[model samples]
Target chain A: MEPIGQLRLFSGTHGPERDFPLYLGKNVVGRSPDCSVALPFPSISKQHAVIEISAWNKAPILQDCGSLNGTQIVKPPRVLPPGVSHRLRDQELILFADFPCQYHRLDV
Target chain B: VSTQELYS
Candidate 1:
């Protein structure tokens, strides 16, 4: 997986199941999602934002968020409540619903 | 650890 540093949320390649590739923001990254993605919406033409991760190098945990909607980690401790931020360690399954994105954070 | 995540 990528480093614990922030990721530049931009565009992604098209997916086989989904209509278009995933999108990323300043502080967000996309992994393998559960559902499909919509390319070029009417209004919500994606947004720019920073994905602040709170974890050290050696021991990464998991991460959630303080977003209006929310973000979740895949594997264990699945549903992360909105408005609550969490740290992510190595090999954590991260999930985002708004854009329907997924990602994994592993060792450096 | 996957290499694909951080090729940048």
Candidate 2:
């Protein structure tokens, strides 16, 4: 595995129970099981969801685990496929279980 | 995505 460089990471830092790395800013959630940011809520909260990760060597690709709330790419049709792995053309939207979080691009 | 976009 390649070590990703320093990243601007954000997410549900702390909750009543614990902290979770949570959602990634990129739509495509990534394939390496390492990319799945854990959740503190065991679910997603709008105000407390999403985070950033190491500057990707390449744009991320996401595989739908068939999340309950749904995972979708932008525009086109919002025609999100349930169990497909897709690449995020852009990394801007912060989303998890309908909750949205924002991420800043520090650098690569 | 490609690295070309990284610069431009």
Candidate 3:
């Protein structure tokens, strides 16, 4: 499977900076071990959010999993409502609770 | 959590 996008961590309590490849389907993000993009931090919930890519060239959608602290898009900063699909743009800064991450589309 | 619910 080819990656459609990626999520790179800027600064976090977990460890050194890292990136997770976003595939064509569902890319689960959370502190849970089962999550596809797992970030084990106190502020991060068990199932924090999901990034879904329907196509290679199309923008991915972000949906919060009713996280306690909430998901946010930094820069023109907006908090995402739980369970609602929000379209994600390339190089958009996202916050999973307090941890900052940036999404980048690889196809572009 | 069930896999069915996670994907749904």
State which candidate has the highest TM-score: 3
Model 2, residue A20: C-alpha shift (Å): 8.3
Model 2: residues with Cα > 4 Å off, grouped in runs: A1-36, A42-55, A74-79, A102-106, B1-8
Better of 2 and 3 by lDDT: 3
Q: Taking the tens digit of each residue's C-alpha lDDT, what string does model 2 give over A10-101?
A: 43344232223323343223322344443433343222212233345454444445554555444443634555545444434435443343
lDDT of candidate model 3 versus the reference:
0.86
Score chain B of candidate 1 by TM-score: 0.16
Residue by residue across A21-98, what tens digits does model 1's lDDT show?
222322432332222232232212232112454443333222333333345555564666644545554334454443
Interface RMSD of 3: 8.8
Q: Check candidate 3 and list the clashing pairs.
A: none
Error in Å for residue A5 of model 1? 4.7
Model 2: pairs clashing at backbone N, Cα or C within 3 Å: A10-A51, A10-A52, A29-A62
The DockQ scores of all candidates, in the order shown, are 0.02, 0.02, 0.04
What is candidate 3's CA lDDT for residue A57?
84
For A1-108, candidate 3 gives per-residue lDDT tens digits of 978899999854567888899998899999888999998776678888999999988889999999888899898889999999999989999988888999999964
Model 1: fraction of the reference interface contacts it also forms:
0.00
